[model samples]
Target: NLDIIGKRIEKIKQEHETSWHYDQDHPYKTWAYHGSYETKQTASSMVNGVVRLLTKPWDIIPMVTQMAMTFKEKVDTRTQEPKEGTKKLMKITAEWLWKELGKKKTPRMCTREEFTRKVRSNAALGAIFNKWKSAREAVEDSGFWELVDKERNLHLEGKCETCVYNMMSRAIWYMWLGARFLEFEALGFLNEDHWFSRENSLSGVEGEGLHKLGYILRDVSKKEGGAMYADDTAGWDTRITLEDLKNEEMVTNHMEGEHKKLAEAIFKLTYQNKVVRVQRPTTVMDIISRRDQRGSGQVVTYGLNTFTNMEAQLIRQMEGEGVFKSIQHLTVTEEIAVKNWLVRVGRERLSRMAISGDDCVVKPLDDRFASALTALNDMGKVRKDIQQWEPSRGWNDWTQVPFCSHHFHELIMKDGRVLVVPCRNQDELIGRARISQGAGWSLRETACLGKSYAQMWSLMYFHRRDLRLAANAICSAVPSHWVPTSRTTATHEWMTTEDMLTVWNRVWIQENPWMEDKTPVESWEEIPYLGKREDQWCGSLIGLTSRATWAKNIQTAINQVRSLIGNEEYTDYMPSMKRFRR
Candidate 1:
């Protein structure tokens, strides 16, 4: 029983704690600090650059900014300690936002409140804190306060008189409004604890626990004269207003529609077409032998160049056309060849019968049947050398029987004189055996030809069958360590394709930050695309049949794929797989 108690505990912790929070003493004081962008400015700018480069200005950037601003404000406001209802609203809002945004750039829980407070209190007196203290003091002396005051009071005078301030203020105010709208839309619809609290003590305890944290953050914010301010839209009235905005149903509908659009854009950008290839045992042995012959210095890397080229081409095509697909080819190499082997049961009873001509009986010993047998025998003799070259012929397995219902029945009847049968359907049995053997031969041949050309048909087949799931896995399974520290979230948080791309873009930008003249959008557009350039050829039917292993494990390659295909042993899309054995 691979119960993995520790892993399960960690998983439970992650599910319950997937969110972002501010770190008072960190580099980005207000951002989540785990992996996602903490500030709306940074997150939006990144998203906008990608959107703008991929589509027109109004097409993706504006909508992305609009949705982001809305979601961010709600999140920011709830970060304050006193806003219990608002925090509750924020949770609801996040659920809605995630549903709407389709999990793009998702934030995760940082530390638990108790742990965070302890950490923050200890760190506030640390040396790094003093560094930021010095920086803040410098801002005051450097006329930054004047700059700030000038901006803040811009709306105090007549709206027309301070055009710069008025425009900036309005933008900030609306951005904040959008944030509130998200919170409102989130909470007003999805808060599920109200009914349960009245009946269950546990529910009440959990609800109150969350509410207390929200309340405390707001109180702390007020004491510090707006400690959570972002200078963008952190503090603004998110109260419902007007018939359109006031109506909860209308708000929900609007948000849902916006969410759908964003979701569609994400799907278009991250969708993948995966193709997997499985190799026969003989093929694996041959590769190992080739590697041995070449020696360490001259040994060829197994599909390393192909993998790199494929990944490069994929990125290029996505940037160019805003779409992504995957083609995966796997060889059942010796490393994992524990079960995939073939063996011969030498001098078998059936083989002995064939040798003695007793098993070559024609139907009623007729002349026409005899001629057909003679032709088949002649063909076999001519192809004897070819058969010797096949991996299936050389490889043999005797331990586990090939238990396929279709093939087992047929195989038994084909050698009926030797392999005794208990039931009827002899002709049907022969037809089934022929089909199974043909299929096995085809799979083997497909594997022999390599992936470039021969493995494409099945790739297209599985892609159409489940491309969405395959794409989700690839886009979400990025290494957590690679994520920026500014993103605050729990350990088990899933990364979105948008977030992953943003990180990718950021890494490129950081390496060349001085290239400021090249707008982010321009840089993304300028990224290069590489295409595949190779051919494949396989010699036989056995080669074709071995390729199916690639298809079988398509979903297992990526974490998300494994999840989506219901690969979990204890749980699956089908209910029966969930049965627990004691």
Candidate 2:
């Protein structure tokens, strides 16, 4: 029984094994590194010399499922790699997964039809739950189909539009290509740099860096008197066209007037580089608008704020109108006005930052920023719920990135959810290099995928919509939170949740998918249950909700599990498959 019986298994494994099955005299080369660095061995059959003074951390004190070092591996265009011969077929029984959910039919508020009915009717948190026949259908129903269709047809020859600009289709293509190529049945990621418990330098204070930049920019503006509107002429000669607003008939008057009112249409030399008409726009701002984006340093994702934030708000407030005006006024004045104003705040370091440490007995020590950062950055003993930090994203005290760059990996769980864990190594795509994490040491490194990695990253960028949904799924799945203060801080500052209906209803809100459709309802008792509490995973021995409402909690947990696994009448619920791209 090669399937399970020993004899045939070993015999055939040796006779036809394709994977490396060689046995070693020693399990690992580190076998000795623990004793000595020499390969085969060396040094002390002995060990420690200690003075009780101390060391590191549970995570950093960390030592395994994490190794294997710098090494070279070869890749060829189309190499002939040996593969195994077909052997005894064994069908793995996974019925227990679903069957277990039904061990004792737990009562749910609705049935398959009822649940589908609610979702189809556009119930709150329902857009994502409704099923569709295909990816195309999903897009059309989502109100993006027309744009997508024209986009597909408009860009024919090449260039970003044809080659990449068609957001919907290209995102669909790139995303599905990866999805199809990688049928992610589930996902996983172990905490690599656990923000929940890390150290950081204390920084001056909130809003200080931003204000310093603002004050500097204000002064520079007074001195330089740069253009509030540079070109003062709206000659819309750009390839990009803003999405048309104002229904078919309303355009004539609005279009003509806006075409000419150019505030630099100030619309002239007469044209319309109209703004995009999206309900909500995303805003990303950085203080000094780092010059690193353009040149020799090759700097990527470290960080931004003041001018960028103002510019972001300015643009955000303006996009709801039809595409009429475009970047006739875009410039670097917002930054140049302040670049020369940075002052070194800390010790022997020229750590340039804009912080007008208002009324300090003495400016905080150089390490103040470091120390404050250390504390602020640590998610520390928090669930990452309302105010906690994140590894992949970073210290979310404001809710986002500050940590040095790191890599991440994914694993699909048997339950069909995605687990996005962080890993180490180059940010350049690891190209499916599987990261192994366990109780201890491990090994792996980046492999050469070359341009494929580049293209994949390109796809990652194009597929922003799906990533947003993925982030939504994650945020809701892992809610961030906070605690009350003792320093006479207002109670409003404390993070608190009453009902958390949003958590129970794991669906995306229309238009603002990353945002929750429901807020904290007064009494959580009536809120439908989600599955078992996830607290233990975060280190909790018990949870308030689970313990408070023990009986019905099981029902919620079971019901959710049932919905997740699917049953005889329904299809398996793969939310990501529908949400991500297609």
The candidate that achieves the highest lDDT relative to the unseen native structure: 1
Task: Give one digit per residue, the lDDT tens place, for model 1 in 1-582.
Answer: 012122322332344354322224333222122221111211122221211211121232232235334233331221212122222222232233223222222212112232234234331111111122532242334353343334223212211111110001111211111112222222312222221121221111112221122222222223211112100111122211111111112222334433433322211111110011112222210000000000000001111111111212212212122121111211234212211111121111111110000001001111121112211221111112233222112102111111111111111111121111112122221121111111222322221211111112111111111221222222222222222112112011122213323443443233333234323422222332111110111111112333233224433444433343232322122111111111
Instruction: Give the range of the ten consecutive residues with the poorest summed lDDT in model 2.
Output: 85-94
Model 1 is weakest, by summed lDDT over 10 consecutive residues, at 285-294
**Candidate 2 lDDT, 1-582, residue by residue in tens:** 112122212332343345323333322221110111111211111110010000001112113113212200110011121111100000001111112212333212212233234234431211111245534344336343344333223322111111110011001111221111111110000011110110111111222211122222222223222111111001111101111111111112222222212111101111111111011122111001010110000000001111111111112112212111222221244223222111211111111111111101111122222122111121011122233322212121211111112222232333343322222222111212112212222110111111122222222221222122212222222212211111111002012232223422222122123233343333222222112232122222134343334222323433442343234222211232332223
All candidates: TM-score: 0.15, 0.16
Please give the CA lDDT of all the candidate structures: 0.21, 0.19
